[PDB]
Structures are given as C-alpha cells and as structure tokens.
Scaffold this active site. Structure first.
Site, mmCIF file in Angstrom:
data_model
loop_
_atom_site.group_PDB
_atom_site.id
_atom_site.type_symbol
_atom_site.label_atom_id
_atom_site.label_comp_id
_atom_site.label_asym_id
_atom_site.label_seq_id
_atom_site.Cartn_x
_atom_site.Cartn_y
_atom_site.Cartn_z
ATOM 1 N N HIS A 12 0.809 -1.249 0.000
ATOM 2 C CA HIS A 12 0.000 0.000 0.000
ATOM 3 C C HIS A 12 0.803 1.238 0.000
ATOM 4 O O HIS A 12 0.154 2.266 -0.076
ATOM 5 C CB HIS A 12 -1.002 0.011 1.153
ATOM 6 N N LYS A 41 -4.761 -10.247 -7.417
ATOM 7 C CA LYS A 41 -5.507 -9.586 -6.322
ATOM 8 C C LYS A 41 -6.465 -8.579 -6.973
ATOM 9 O O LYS A 41 -6.011 -7.721 -7.782
ATOM 10 C CB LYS A 41 -4.563 -8.904 -5.422
ATOM 11 N N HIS A 119 -3.608 -2.900 7.772
ATOM 12 C CA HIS A 119 -4.532 -3.218 6.648
ATOM 13 C C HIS A 119 -5.090 -1.972 6.071
ATOM 14 O O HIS A 119 -5.297 -1.006 6.780
ATOM 15 C CB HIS A 119 -5.661 -4.148 7.097
ATOM 16 N N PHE A 120 -5.390 -1.995 4.781
ATOM 17 C CA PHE A 120 -6.022 -0.850 4.123
ATOM 18 C C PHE A 120 -7.496 -1.192 4.016
ATOM 19 O O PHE A 120 -7.918 -2.065 3.269
ATOM 20 C CB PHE A 120 -5.406 -0.612 2.748
ATOM 21 N N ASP A 121 -8.302 -0.436 4.729
ATOM 22 C CA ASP A 121 -9.733 -0.734 4.822
ATOM 23 C C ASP A 121 -10.507 -0.099 3.655
ATOM 24 O O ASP A 121 -11.362 -0.788 3.067
ATOM 25 C CB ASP A 121 -10.309 -0.360 6.224
#
Length: 124
Positions: A12, A41, A119-121
C-alpha cells in the site's frame, strides 16, 4: 516471511511518487509488489504520502472497520492515492488493472506496538 506492518508497506505504500506515473502504473506495481504471484488480487490501493504521514493516521479519527472491529482510523484530510482494480477481462497469469488517481481520505486498520497501519480498509 513478513510482519503485518512490512506487508502493509509493500502492498500500500508508494512514497517515491506524488501520483501514478502512467495508465500502466497498476499493471507495473501489482506485479512488482508481488500482488499477482498466486492470483490476480482484484483491488488494491497505493498511498503517495510519506510513511510518517500514513503512520500518523493511527492517531486520527477512530471508526469501525468493515469487519466490525473498531481498530480502524480515518485520516482527517485527504491524501494522494492510486486505486487499482482488475479489469473484467483480466485472467491470471496475465493480470490486468485499471489505474485511477485520486485524492481521498484513507481508512486503515492499526495493530501492534508501535501502533501502525497493517490493513487498508477503504478510501473515502
């Protein structure tokens, strides 16, 4: 093979550039960051801000995560990001993506001590 924090950086972060460098940015970065190794992905976001500025978000606005836990944080203002989404025709092992440049708040899940993004939400 990787800490959550290092995985977040690989998936990210792109602090080198202010924005996506071409329409093929996602194709190049999803491959170089190893996000097409086992499968394509389908969605991924890269953040064009300094690591310190993204880590800072874990001290900003606490919000619920999509999974319903509440260790997510929304940035107070907006950030340069590039959103990648696999095309409708993409098929592994020739994964293909659309590149969209945007300026949006980010929402990240934070963990650990030091408490940092893992984490990238979402973007908003």
């Amino acid at each position: 093979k990787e800490t959550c924090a290092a995985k977040f950086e690989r998936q990210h972060m792109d602090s080198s550039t202010s924005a996506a460098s071409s329409s093929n940015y996602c194709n190049q970065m999803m491959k170089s960051r190893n996000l097409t190794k086992d499968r394509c992905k389908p969605v991924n976001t890269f953040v064009h801000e300094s690591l310190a500025d993204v880590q800072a978000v874990c001290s900003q606005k606490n919000v619920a995560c999509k999974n319903g836990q509440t260790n997510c944080y929304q940035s107070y203002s907006t950030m340069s990001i590039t959103e990648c989404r696999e095309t409708g025709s993409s098929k592994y092992p020739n994964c293909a993506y659309k590149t969209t440049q945007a300026n949006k708040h980010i929402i990240v899940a934070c963990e650990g001590n030091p408490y940092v993004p893992c984490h990238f939400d979402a973007s908003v």
